[PDB]
Amino acid sequence: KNIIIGAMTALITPFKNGKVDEQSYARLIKRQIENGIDAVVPVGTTGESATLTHEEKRTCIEIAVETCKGTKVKVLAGAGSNATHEAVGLAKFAKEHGADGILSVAPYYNKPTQQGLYEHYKAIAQSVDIPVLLYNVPGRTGCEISTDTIIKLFRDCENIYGVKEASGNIDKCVDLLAHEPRMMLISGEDAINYPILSNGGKGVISVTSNLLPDMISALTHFALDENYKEAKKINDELYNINKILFCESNPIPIKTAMYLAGLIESLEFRLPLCSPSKENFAKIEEVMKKYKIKGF
Amino acid sequence: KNIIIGAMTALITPFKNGKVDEQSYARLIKRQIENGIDAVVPVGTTGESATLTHEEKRTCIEIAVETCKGTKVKVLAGAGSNATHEAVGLAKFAKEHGADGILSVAPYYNKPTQQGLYEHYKAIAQSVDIPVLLYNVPGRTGCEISTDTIIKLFRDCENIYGVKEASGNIDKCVDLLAHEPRMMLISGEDAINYPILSNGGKGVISVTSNLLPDMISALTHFALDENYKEAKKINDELYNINKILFCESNPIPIKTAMYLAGLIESLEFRLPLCSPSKENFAKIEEVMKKYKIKGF
Ligand SMILES: N[C@@H](Cc1c[nH]c[nH+]1)C(=O)O
Ligand SMILES: N[C@@H](Cc1c[nH]c[nH+]1)C(=O)O
Ligand SMILES: [Mg+2]
Ligand SMILES: [Mg+2]
Ligand SMILES: [Mg+2]
Ligand SMILES: [Mg+2]
Ligand SMILES: [Mg+2]
Ligand SMILES: [Mg+2]
Numbered sequence A, B: 001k002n003i004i005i006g007a008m009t010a011l012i013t014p015f016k017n018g019k020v021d022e023q024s025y026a027r028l029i030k031r032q033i034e035n036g037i038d039a040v041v042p043v044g045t046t047g048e049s050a051t052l053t054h055e056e057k058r059t060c061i062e063i064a065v066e067t068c069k070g071t072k073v074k075v076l077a078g079a080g081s082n083a084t085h086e087a088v089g090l091a092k093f094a095k096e097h098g099a100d101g102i103l104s105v106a107p108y109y110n111k112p113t114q115q116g117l118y119e120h121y122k123a124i125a126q127s128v129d130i131p132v133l134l135y136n137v138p139g140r141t142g143c144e145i146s147t148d149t150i151i152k153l154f155r156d157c158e159n160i161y162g163v164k165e166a167s168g169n170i171d172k173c174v175d176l177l178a179h180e181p182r183m184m185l186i187s188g189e190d191a192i193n194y195p196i197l198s199n200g201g202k203g204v205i206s207v208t209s210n211l212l213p214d215m216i217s218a219l220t221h222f223a224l225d226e227n228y229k230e231a232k233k234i235n236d237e238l239y240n241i242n243k244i245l246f247c248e249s250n251p252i253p254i255k256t257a258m259y260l261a262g263l264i265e266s267l268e269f270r271l272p273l274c275s276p277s278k279e280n281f282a283k284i285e286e287v288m289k290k291y292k293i294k295g296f
Helices: A022-034 A054-068 A084-096 A114-127 A147-156 A170-179 A190-198 A213-224 A228-244 A252-260 A278-288 B022-034 B054-068 B084-096 B114-127 B147-156 B170-179 B190-198 B213-224 B228-244 B252-260 B278-288
Strands: A006-010 A039-041 A074-078 A101-105 A132-136 A160-165 A184-187 A203-206 B006-010 B039-041 B074-078 B101-105 B132-136 B160-165 B184-187 B203-206
Touching: A006 A213, A022 A039, A022 A054, A054 A074, A054 A084, A084 A101, A084 A114, A101 A114, A114 A132, A114 A147, A132 A147, A147 A160, A147 A170, A160 A170, A170 A184, A170 A190, A184 A190, A190 A203, A190 A213, A190 A228, A203 A213, A213 A228, A228 A278, A252 A278, B006 B213, B022 B039, B022 B054, B054 B074, B054 B084, B084 B101, B084 B114, B101 B114, B114 B132, B114 B147, B132 B147, B147 B160, B147 B170, B160 B170, B170 B184, B170 B190, B184 B190, B190 B203, B190 B213, B190 B228, B203 B213, B213 B228, B228 B278, B252 B278
Parallel strands: A006 A039, A006 A203, A039 A074, A074 A101, A101 A132, A132 A160, A160 A184, A184 A203, B006 B039, B006 B203, B039 B074, B074 B101, B101 B132, B132 B160, B160 B184, B184 B203
Antiparallel strands: none
């Protein structure tokens, strides 16, 4: 299978006076490239996929693709939807605009059965010829892609090569790689990056790397080299910021941290997301103080 | 406040060869009207809102509006979204196409904060001049509209008149009506229709009424007339079917039952929804046996 693994960043989408700040977006991607990231995920959850227009999503993917041209960094475009015809459309769209692969979140809100998730992802995978990474996040979607469904999709569909797991369930991570050790398990939960990698996971799709790309890159590469002592040390150092970045729903804290670091011009979100409380603003600012944040 | 209350039906959307069966839709709505329903909800969750196109939603709303002309029955159109700009647009769309009010589900997947939910619904309510019913269903959305936020919205926004509660939490229902007894609490969970109504709730937005509209209307109207004994008796009779209609994610069981009863032509869903398991198919058919299902 063709794969996209390693240290990856779920990119924030900066807004300026209500519009995508395209220069800021390109600069942030260059900063990620220059700090050792192996792939960027435009218009994922952290990128406020739900509230971007088709035209804004096209712009973001094209900027990611153009900025990564001539480097080793891959573009793994968010393309999921809770309507299968839409998810197929978004997959084809991402491929046509140059993406190296797609991240495709489990349908949210309408709670399909396992049979339905199987047919959903089978349809998407048959629609394009680029790698497909499943994305399980039951706390946001209301459903879970079971281990058996993930394993059947990996075994039956040529482009489906693994899953980004954001379920806080290390037992599921064991179940997955004990029964299907050829899949790429990708951490979708920064606080437990090291435990997932040490069980044979092969990458992270990170929120914290927006702010500390160098640290998340090193963590992941140490771990892939089986320098587990060094990878755990970084994971442990990162725990406080990894947790504070979810004091409110992601990406509210990470955008706040990026703004406080001077990495984006404006602290703007698209409704229904909005600025954090004053208390959480101060807690994010305080936890940031112990970390060395890279500039441009 | 202008309100829409009483016995209401979350309409299934029948498909035939992948398209909305318009005739069937009109015929099902006339059947609801003839069996005492007070309002119909086109294109809600039970109507597979997530997977219908804009043209299909317009069609369903207009068929509902046209079928209710000349009757007391109101059209409370599903218009929610997890993007505030899209939810505002869908509310305007619903009003433009003849709806008497809108049902607006809490943003799913992106998990806004209470502050963001307040701003979300404030924008929607200021965009139209028709009643707005909030809709809380945390098991599908991943977030909860708190009691305090619901009460602030009801007090601050002229058009927001209550909430459809589908949270399986009668404590919340008490909390709401104990602190704000003027709002319209609407049951969004058939099995507990009578407990919600007996606590001062003023209607239901039902799944079961698709199949058994006479029994749900009678239940609701007995309760509103303070004939609690009669209302509870029908609630108790309905318990088995109210539960089996959630053996798989709604609307998979209700459409299956409608098909088994001959009320729709084809057991079709839009991916990612799909037919139930054979076992569940048999369970639904078995539970139906004790009930009298009205025809056309
Ligand atoms: N807001 C809807 C549709 C959409 C996605 N992106 C922009 N709009 C969703 O989250 O699925
Ligand atoms: N599927 C997306 C957008 C959509 C609604 N209906 C059709 N498409 C959602 O659930 O918000
Ligand atoms: Mg690598
Ligand atoms: Mg390359
Ligand atoms: Mg949930
Ligand atoms: Mg198989
Ligand atoms: Mg090495
Ligand atoms: Mg009472």
